Symmetry: D3
Amino acid sequence: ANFEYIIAEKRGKNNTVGLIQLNRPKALNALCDGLIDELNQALKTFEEDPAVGAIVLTGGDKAFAAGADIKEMQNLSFQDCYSSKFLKHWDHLTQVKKPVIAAVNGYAFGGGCELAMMCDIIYAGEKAQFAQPEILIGTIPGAGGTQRLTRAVGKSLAMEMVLTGDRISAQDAKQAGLVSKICPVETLVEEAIQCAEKIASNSKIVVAMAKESVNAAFEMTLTEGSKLEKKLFYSTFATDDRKEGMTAFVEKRKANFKDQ
Amino acid sequence: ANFEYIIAEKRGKNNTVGLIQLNRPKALNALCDGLIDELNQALKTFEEDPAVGAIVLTGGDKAFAAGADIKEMQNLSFQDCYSSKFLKHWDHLTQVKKPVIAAVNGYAFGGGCELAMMCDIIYAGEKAQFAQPEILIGTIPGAGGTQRLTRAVGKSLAMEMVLTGDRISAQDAKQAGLVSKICPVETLVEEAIQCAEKIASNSKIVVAMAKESVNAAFEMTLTEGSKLEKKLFYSTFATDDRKEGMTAFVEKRKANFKDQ
Amino acid sequence: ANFEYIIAEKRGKNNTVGLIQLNRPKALNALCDGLIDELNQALKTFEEDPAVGAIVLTGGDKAFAAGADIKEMQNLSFQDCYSSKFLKHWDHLTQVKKPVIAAVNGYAFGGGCELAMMCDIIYAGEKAQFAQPEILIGTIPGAGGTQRLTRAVGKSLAMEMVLTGDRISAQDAKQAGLVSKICPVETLVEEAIQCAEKIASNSKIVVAMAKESVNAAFEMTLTEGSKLEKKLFYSTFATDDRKEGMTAFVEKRKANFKDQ
Amino acid sequence: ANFEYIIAEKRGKNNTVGLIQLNRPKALNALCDGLIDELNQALKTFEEDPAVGAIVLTGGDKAFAAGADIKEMQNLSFQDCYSSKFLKHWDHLTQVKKPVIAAVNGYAFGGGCELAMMCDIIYAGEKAQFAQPEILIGTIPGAGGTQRLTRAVGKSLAMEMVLTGDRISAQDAKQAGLVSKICPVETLVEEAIQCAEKIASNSKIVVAMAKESVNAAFEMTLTEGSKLEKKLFYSTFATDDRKEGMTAFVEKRKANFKDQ
Amino acid sequence: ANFEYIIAEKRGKNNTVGLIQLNRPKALNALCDGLIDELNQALKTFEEDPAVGAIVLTGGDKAFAAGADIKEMQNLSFQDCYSSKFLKHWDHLTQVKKPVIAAVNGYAFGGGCELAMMCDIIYAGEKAQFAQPEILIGTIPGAGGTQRLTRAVGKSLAMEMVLTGDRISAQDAKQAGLVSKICPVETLVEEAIQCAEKIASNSKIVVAMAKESVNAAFEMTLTEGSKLEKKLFYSTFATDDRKEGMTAFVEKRKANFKDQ
Amino acid sequence: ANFEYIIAEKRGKNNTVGLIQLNRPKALNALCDGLIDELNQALKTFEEDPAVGAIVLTGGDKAFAAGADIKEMQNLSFQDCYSSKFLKHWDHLTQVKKPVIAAVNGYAFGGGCELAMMCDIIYAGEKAQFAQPEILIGTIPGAGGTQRLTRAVGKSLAMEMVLTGDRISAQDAKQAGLVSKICPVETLVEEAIQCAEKIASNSKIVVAMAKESVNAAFEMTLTEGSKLEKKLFYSTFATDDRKEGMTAFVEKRKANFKDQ
Ligand SMILES: [Mg+2]
Ligand SMILES: [Mg+2]
């Protein structure tokens, strides 16, 4: 559909990467309800696209997402927040089966840091900054800003970032484990698109199985996690993609996958 | 009160930071029963102080805490450990609701490293060292020296430090995620006090809710953790400090919080 | 017994370290059925050796283990993999009670990285590389390559390595926490042997208790983990090595341990 | 919309109970795609109805639901099932916030038993029968027929019912804990409607909080469950309904609740 | 310390059973703060008594405990509950190491059922009734009335009792598993005292270990539960009472235990 | 091999049921090392038999298994027990993939009750009794007598049985959920054999998947349990038995399963 807050298009060769770019530069990509609706529409459109195998989520060069709109949430009481479940459409990225690579350039504060952490892979620029300033306005992060952050960077750094609201550099996020790669500002999007192309070049079903196996590490114990990983490695044998890849490996050539 | 092992006072402007400094320099701040009792009393006093919003725990410049007294625990038998629940008052720091910042200077060995890891934020000096030498005397760390350490720095480094008892530098704890900031020895205490002042400047109830949400990341799954975070974010709306902070954000000014 | 794929011997002074060296240099130490059988035989032999306290697992100078044989697993189906529990002998290293130090030199790809992550301590060379290329042949890592990796290095880096199959340097693994020490290619084995000698010098039963307490951090919550740690610290008092070590600490001398 | 497989209406005095009755008597209420879509639509309509406080789900007098259609799932392969998440709309009843009372009359086999167990309260007739015959056609229950059943009736009875497919009487389900009340066949619907009216008479928000607290018992440990229960009990104090109820208890009268 | 709400005495031969009888017959044993304080004092006194090995908690013949005083909690806000942690002294019974047998006669409503479920063994009379009427006053049970209840009687019956507030007979509680034995009203206390005497006649430390092993079933998985059970069965060997009991079993006689 | 403590044979028509009968009537089937070794040998022999689909474990008419040999473990210490892992060969029944039906007749005390609870289905005679008398000799059940028992029969009854050692009748175990069916002592074995034949007639791989899905209910949460159940129900589509059974159901006939 015609979006007014975001820009959705297919990038890279073979058109296998879906680029969802936030286009709110005057508000520093403020996460409003309309922007979230357009983002979810683009996400489901890219998920229902057979040619797309990976999604790249990015905002602006100076700001990825500076948090939710506060004026629409100031006059909310406890009843209207508990009932009606206020930030519920804020977790549709966690239900996406295809990998979503976050290209964080500039400010990723409040809701932006949570939306980035909800993605599988986070690519941060040279001047990218992460913070959780919810404590400054009398609230707490309520979209994964504490659960995923503490699991990623540890208790101490997450406790400091949550209780103080201070910002951390991209280098600190890489050393702590929040992001997996640091790229220049003018080439972050291109490297994220190349990584998404490398991801989508494989079998989509096996990639989804691997993503589920990785995500299960935060929901189950080590023994049950290993058992589920063994069951998934057994189940991946029932696909033609596994046999095709093993044939291309034994008889050295390029593997032609058909997502089945 | 008349303390013989620790020094308790309120530091910083407006006296919002409680400083609990171990005062056993000739014994390398050995964690004895009287010192633990005085630490618990000071923690309770600072918890029951409305003007205190954060606590800073520190020791000496050359040693933070070099472990418990071995003489008072050699004659102890298996039955006398289980019954009297040996080392039962060593986890009172985990029951505090206000944030406690550990300013570790010098040696933090055995019980000292566990007491530091039990704090929310760990500030270490340039010459600070962390180790678990329990394996050297025929015992294992029994106050969180294995659970929290493995969750913070990983399996490999924790296994090495536990089975070998070797010391790690402050830079190692920083790159591994054990500590959150490296500060000079002459200014570590003041930087910890400034961080505790920045923490106490916010709403104490919202800060405690955020601390609980962060601590829940080690006790529940990611889904249930996110559900509890959502419930806490919804409950935050029932406080006057939330509305005050959101109004101060809307009309740009300084938010005056009343801890309610 | 006489091995054809591996080399098993006791190294170090006092013969306290068991060295299991993979001896398949022309196949990059491919994890085959015979190699796994010989590895399990050497592991149980060293476990049934009262003079051995720690095991060092290493491969070649240019490759630790470059994955399993794809030829013996290409013609496998879903039923044959499930009704035979494929790769069920691949986790015998996780049942070892004595510490196992992984001296990873060169390539550790696929099954190699999984076998290395199952060890307690991972020692990597300067030119050591870790990767999970299973996604390139149409399968997923099914021997702990996702559960342990995501817990160690984090969500983002593990997701990238799994979905892309790209390699990471030893420095990246050290920064992310996958390995614990970087050593030269010419001395990595000697450093691992010295670490295993320092480990075996302590009480083997107390060392096993500490290893169990550390491993329990990935199978239980923080509260139950601390409770089990307290119970193990209480049970360690019923050993003769505990009082001997405490007496040697009180009256400064060398503690003579008898593994009881 | 106009339903062809189910009947949706508001029953009972004050029209606070939504009755969703399956209307496929010739197919023993086979769970097809259209019937599931209509059930989800009726559930959403009753959820978005302020005048409805509870839902009652029932079928026919001789059969509640005899499982899904096997014809629409025989020609399905593994890839079509996985890459489309077969039976994904079958768990929309677990996302409902208002209590759903299952009035099971007659046969509740496989999918019917799963849909009944997914409800909060199960009301069964004297001639009601429960079974999981999936093992007879070469499959396993895949909509909670093993997880919830084993947690409700125990390990032994669930194992027997799953591996044998034998039916159990309503008295057996009552003594095992599967159902909570046995009612005559001619009055089961009326008793379920009266129970839902007793439920709908209370505060909807407090009822939803209690439902969440009860459902959390199967998602985490007892300690975290009690902590979440304490937090929800504290959050209840921010509603006007709790104050109104406590005031009506003090000054003995009927409490007028407004769902806020 | 003379009590005004409860009666504390030692009953049974050898004076090994501590009887804590609620003595509020006009208020149906309303759980007030003073009664809770006296109960905690009696509990800690009986725990610190070497002659007492088991505790029996009971109220009146017509009422065990009819819930907390609503007048004390009527004028309480959300901030006053959270901060201050309302009902925080209500879980001191869960920290008792010695077994506590609940002799429930008459009404056990609201806080009474929660206090009874926190006991290890629950003994109910012929006319004993259990209910959770918190939903009738606009609140939810906040002292374990949902977590333990759902784990004991199942999902359906607990959901019904919570959302409706209806009472269940002692027979239904025995069938669902809430209680373990039904006794006449005039002899319930005597049978509970006899059971507590049978319990206290064994080794107190082994009894505490068994209680911990049983309570761990709700805090860990089956694998980790069995592991902790194995570790505790190994740890019980280091006590003299284990060897004494085994000697009395081999050489048939009466075992003389010394709680060590 | 020729057994001296047990009797192993194939019973029932088509020889699809393996009967492992304990043959120690003069010692009340005491669980000794040789008996456990022969039991494990018969179990692995029946597991490696393609014609056997289910195993029936029974003892004598007056005693199923009266616990382990006491004189075999009187002179054992804490170190000898921890380091040798006492009772480790006792959980080989939990690793069996095919269902094991426990035909418990007579006394099932101590280790016998644990071995019975480790089975999937428990069939008890009219005069069968279950108890955990470990507390009477100064020890605790260390082979699943507390974890599985508390999960099956509840907290109160398991606590009573563990702390008192009293016996429960077969009817009590049936109403509590410990056993699934009560049968006469003269026909219990035949009924268990008929049940195993009904189990063995189905697809062995699908039966193993169902057993795994049921056993996973005690190792994971409800959400992850349902996810693993969905994944197993998707994987079962890749078997030939699923399509054969579905075709036999569509066109009504007898399904011919080939265990593939
Ligand atoms: Mg890290
Ligand atoms: Mg039951």
